[PDB]
Amino acid sequence: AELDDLTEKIRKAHQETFPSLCQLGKYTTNSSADHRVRLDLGLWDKFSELATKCIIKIVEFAKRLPGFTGLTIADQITLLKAACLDILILRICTRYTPEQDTMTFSDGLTLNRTQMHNAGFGPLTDLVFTFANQLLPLEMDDTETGLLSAICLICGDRQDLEEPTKVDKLQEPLLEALKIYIRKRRPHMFPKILMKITDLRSISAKGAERVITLKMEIPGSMPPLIQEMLEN
């Protein structure tokens, strides 16, 4: 009952900070829609702008997680910076429309693969779409996506944690919660969803070089929160 209570709370934290694809008004753009280019600055400006907003929403999601507030701000910051890209990647991949081969952002902006590539994903584009495509068969809902996000976040083995053991105990209930929910809702889903964390980490790891490359390409400055996120 306390685990059913935790599950409902995580689902809510997610739903409140992440607009569903079905509850969003999709809109497109014709900017470099059919030709891949190094970087479309107009798409980068819009994309990076939305990235900043989503990062803020991720911090809000984290704050809504039971116990997170309890940890020290130092630990809150370490956990967030280590898992933010993972979560940003999972979020955009959850708004993938296979028929149109597009992904939709929080404000309804819907870009095709080419535009995703041109907005900044570059050489990581196909890798991201493949992750999104492999996500579909799992048919996950708000609570599973939220529990997965929380599992990516609450990791007590992150380096520089002031209270690693306290973090471990906060994640302990998460795996069980997910275990139980998966079997109560749609009766091998447990390990398949968990394996995705690895795929996720693998992709976010490629972000370190990507940001350096983008910085070298843009005429302006890298948005402060993105900077802070990969600044480590």
Ligand SMILES: C/C(=C\c1ccc(C(=O)O)cc1)c1ccc2c(c1)C(C)(C)CCC2(C)C
């Ligand atoms: C995945 C991402 C940003 C993002 C995710 C979701 C929304 C939304 O509105 O729902 C908006 C933006 C992102 C952010 C930064 C970076 C990347 C992706 C890649 C993977 C291209 C590597 C380089 C940096 C700049 C770190």
